[PDB]
Design an enzyme around this catalytic site. Structure first.
Site, short mmCIF file in Angstrom:
data_model
loop_
_atom_site.label_atom_id
_atom_site.label_comp_id
_atom_site.label_asym_id
_atom_site.label_seq_id
_atom_site.Cartn_x
_atom_site.Cartn_y
_atom_site.Cartn_z
N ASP A 1 -7.79 -8.25 13.84
CA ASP A 1 -9.06 -8.89 13.48
C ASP A 1 -8.90 -9.84 12.30
O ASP A 1 -9.89 -10.21 11.66
CB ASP A 1 -10.11 -7.83 13.13
CG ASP A 1 -9.72 -6.99 11.93
OD1 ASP A 1 -10.48 -6.06 11.59
OD2 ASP A 1 -8.66 -7.24 11.31
N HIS B 1 -7.54 -9.23 9.36
CA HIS B 1 -7.53 -8.65 8.01
C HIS B 1 -6.13 -8.55 7.40
O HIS B 1 -5.11 -8.69 8.10
CB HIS B 1 -8.22 -7.27 7.99
CG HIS B 1 -7.38 -6.15 8.52
ND1 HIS B 1 -7.38 -5.77 9.85
CD2 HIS B 1 -6.51 -5.31 7.90
CE1 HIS B 1 -6.56 -4.75 10.02
NE2 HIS B 1 -6.02 -4.45 8.86
N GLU C 1 -10.88 -4.82 4.30
CA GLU C 1 -11.81 -4.92 5.42
C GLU C 1 -12.16 -6.38 5.76
O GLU C 1 -11.95 -7.28 4.95
CB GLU C 1 -13.11 -4.19 5.05
CG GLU C 1 -13.89 -4.82 3.86
CD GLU C 1 -13.41 -4.40 2.46
OE1 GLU C 1 -12.26 -3.91 2.32
OE2 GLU C 1 -14.17 -4.58 1.49
N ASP D 1 0.77 -1.24 0.00
CA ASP D 1 0.00 0.00 0.00
C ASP D 1 0.80 1.29 0.00
O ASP D 1 2.03 1.28 -0.01
CB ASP D 1 -0.97 0.05 1.20
CG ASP D 1 -0.64 -0.97 2.29
OD1 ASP D 1 0.44 -0.91 2.89
OD2 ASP D 1 -1.50 -1.82 2.55
#
Lengths: 247, 247, 247, 247, 247, 247
Positions: free
Chosen positions: F141, F143, F148, F72
């Protein structure tokens, strides 16, 4: 509940033996007020009896005013038979300590009236009042003594179909004890340990109901912790770190 | 806990009826010491009342010294109305046996002081001492009588908003019974049976708290076992095989 | 169990305060029969004390015959220190109401004999008989006060290693109360709320054992309901809709 | 996925054998287009080979144009040794049917270049195109052949440390088959059957990934269904009722 | 996966209709490159067809170059019968829009060769290449169309025993679509929604396998969210907040 | 899947670095056939870049024919800003090795046409064919990158709302890599590790879908194993014991 995480069966026996000795010496039993001890048989408590005997021989404890109640006995099997619970208990413990015959309570698997025998056993315990410490083992399926999974938590001493039958104290008999200490050894007991410590209360895994008992202790070896979460074992290891020094 | 796995609703009724008869005949009730029976209404206990009545007609039991307490009644509904619990109980049971009117206890849904009525009901039970056997059914969500899921396990007789209201004994009222026997019929009760037998104790499925009761029995038909593991049903089938012969 | 679903911390405090006021006013305490209130400290009960104080100032309640017992205190910390539990309780509650000094019970973290101090605290509660209402908070891991997860449900007041130590009432001390009301605020308490309301009974999440308590209430704000099923919250919202009007 | 619930190991073998025969006879293999069959060894497929042989002897099928690929072989073990996979396959199957030597593919556990041997095995399968039907068994922990739990679903033929080593086809090798049929026998396979049929997809129980395969069949005996829900077994029993007639 | 949380069935239909319209208008279909739409019948898609029709009447979309494929049809039932899928589709959709007869594909439940009919249906889809958007509903048990739970994910169009039979596209047929949009309405679909969104992938709840699909959307009403965790619904509500404005 | 259980973050970096070096040296990249490496930023890969650099300085590897693709970059943030992904990558890796500028691929967060930029990034990867090894981290979580939870497994490079936005490769982009290696450090990643290794496949914990990937590796430190069962960690520790010697 306490979980004492140790490495070997020998350490478990030494820890359990010391705990019994400390409870006795703090209680300071006398002829009129004896310390009442509940006891199991089999391979599981072997290292504990061995440790209890050397402590007695070293002068650390006397069983002169200790009253014992054993969990079971085979039905119709001659008391002096080498495979009876009576023979096991004397050979591994009573033969080596100063406990008097009148302080020893073992179910009579040869009693004429089975139901009467079991009834009197419960009566004998109440005559003393309560068992101060009951030591036991746990089945691969979480059961206690000869009690079946889904046994009532208030079950009492009775005959059970496995010799062909055996007399066994009930779950209620065990739960009425002031303190319950369960020895857990082997990877075959891993699922039972998990149910007792991490699982929820349920009558299918009888051991899980000790979560509701006022003073329960699980003493386990390394192989038995296989089904616990790493953080669960870490938590008890840290909390009990100071109480396992010297075993 | 016991789980009696039967095939049909008729077998469940015959098994439940015989159990009640045996408890009564072993208790041997008299005017000064009556056998106290807790009772439910509805489609579920239909085959049980039918069986109890033929046993009475065959001379196997007398209700002369049996005192009954029913679980509920509608509020503001005329007692003699055909849909009241009173009418159901007489029509299906009391009209056919020798129980005296003074031994029958039903909540008065037309009492002027609702709270007083419920209070007296609990008082009446204590005046006798205890309910020896309480028979009931179970809701699809595991609830008991008109008690809501998540009801307190110590809840007592009170009014409940579903007529518009009903008076119902509480979970504590049921649990105080010496023995509790729940009739389970239909696939719609499968999840409730599973929660009671295989699940863990939790207040959302009230029936699961019977796992903590000293003497609980579930009597079920085949369709209700749908959510159990094959091995669970096999286990109870084998253990109870000798107790379901003849139904 | 009751679950009062509210939106904000302020509403929770107003609801909890009103519940305490109603219990007191219905009990009608006198010098010979005081209303015994168990109390917590910290950020959680802040809005409740604030609400209790304005109700007192509005003439809705008097604490003249209310006896309080607090959950904990730091060891070795000067009582008048601004961070002690003593200072917190006076500053947020006692300084503003009419409760007499002799009715206030706080653990003395500076007592010479720690074990004696804790023993006397339990003795003081029994001298009154029982705590009528015990208000508390809940840990992120479901624990109560300074009790550890897997604490015995019969644990009593004792010293705990977190100052370095603190004195805390036990789980048994809390459970012996006639009614227990737990304030739940924040998303960080979501897993604990879920364990208390939807989960099964288990000693790892101490709060879950309130399911077995005769009269338990959870008062929560919106962020704390994150882990509940939509239908669970809907169920309590509808059932408690009439009891949250006006907060 | 299909689940064929049968009672005995013999019925499973007869059902599996017939399925293989039907697939072959419908495919109508020729020298230029042979039917490719993947095969296992051990106690599990015993009744299936026995059934396949009698069907061949009754003239119901010919293996003249059937090409086989076996799952594994021991490393360094003499091919003609009685305990090799080669010996097992000839003794239980090849010795009794009309399959030509050039159509038989078994891993050479004595190949000089292990990695080359495994590579060529995969090459041989692709040279034919695809395995039309791969029959196998399942480990107590859900694994396939000598593949470890958590094996990659794309794993290929390779050597594995259990002789000391063995050559085994990979999970990818098995999944590339057009149809996969797993024989499940014994209560020791109950947890694996449950994971395959009722559980969710997960690499720890390799068998569960067959849920993603386009054409998977589990053929099981009664003892292996112990961990399934009664309704699960009922569902497959009804759906497959017409396909198990005659076995 | 996307989860569009809406309140009413009408909003779901308006949202689904707009999504279809936008996909069509962005695709800009022509005679040589038509937009291929998969469609369901029944009460569930009612508000969506209603919305699609008003959008067409308002000049927002043309179905002149849209090709449709329906999920099923009854076997042996006269096409013009009022209860056929054909009648439902024309009455609720085709009668009101500008789609040409040659662009409509419905399974012929009266075809002489059932297997040939289903085979050709799959052939027709491939002749176009792929379904760009397939809209469907979901069974209470998570199934799709007439596919059974535990259906192969690669199942194809075939006849199914529920008229007595029906022709239904397979799970593979649905999964091959470029985008799948499932309409979820009613509390009876709550467990299916939970399995699709929060549960793990498993063939028993077919809908859960959409988690593996490249572009899946669930459009649901409020009653269907009952089994989701409050935080799950909150998460999708916030993420999709800007895409549900105006419905 | 492989799970490399190590103790410290430094060991993880040394193990990961060596794995990358070995893959490169075995691939033997040239100008016409470069080794394509996918890379992450942040605190997690710090020790790995440090290890890769010393290995390069020791002459163990050359990046002359290694092409990199980063996960990213921030949108609208000046490339030379000290907090950009570009600055992080050069400062921690590119400044110290022999990789040519034309072999470095980073998303341009300042591109005029965002959608075009992301599209070209995917195009660039395909121009090379495939990423041979993609190294990444994992969210608390579960990811991946800026994707998401519940992201489609086929999602592609796109802009995401967290600067205000960021460009991130998709889950499909990551899964298309020949091999995926995820670095797991810290107790905050314990639940994610558990979901990846012991849990079932589900789109809510994206990391769990690596169970379906042909060649996935998790490299973790001790604190991250907190939620695994003791036996799970023991299993991987024994299986990988020979591959962690020397780190």
């Amino acid at each position: 509940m306490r979980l004492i995480p140790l490495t070997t069966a020998e350490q478990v026996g030494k820890w359990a033996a010391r705990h019994i000795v400390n409870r006795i010496n703090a209680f300071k039993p006398t002829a009129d007020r004896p310390f009442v001890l509940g006891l199991p048989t089999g391979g599981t408590p072997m290292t504990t009896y061995k440790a209890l005997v050397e402590m007695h021989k070293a002068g650390q404890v006397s069983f002169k005013h200790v009253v014992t109640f054993n969990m079971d006995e085979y039905v119709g099997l001659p008391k002096e038979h080498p495979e009876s619970y009576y023979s096991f208990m004397h050979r591994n413990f009573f033969d080596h300590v100063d406990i008097p015959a009148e302080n020893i309570n073992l179910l009579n698997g040869n009693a004429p009236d089975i139901d009467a025998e079991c009834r009197q056993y419960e009566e004998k315990i109440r005559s003393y009042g309560k068992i101060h410490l009951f030591m036991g083992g746990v089945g691969n399926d979480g059961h206690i003594a000869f009690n079946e999974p889904a046994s009532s938590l208030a079950s009492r001493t009775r005959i059970k179909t496995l010799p062909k039958y055996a007399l066994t104290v009930g779950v209620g008999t065990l739960l009425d004890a002031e303190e319950v200490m369960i020895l857990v050894l082997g990877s075959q007991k891993a699922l039972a340990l998990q149910a007792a410590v991490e699982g929820c209360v349920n009558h299918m895994w009888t051991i899980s109901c000790l979560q509701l008992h006022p003073k329960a202790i699980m003493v386990c070896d390394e192989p038995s912790t296989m089904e616990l979460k790493v953080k669960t074992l870490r938590y008890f290891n840290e909390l009990e770190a100071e109480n396992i020094k010297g075993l």
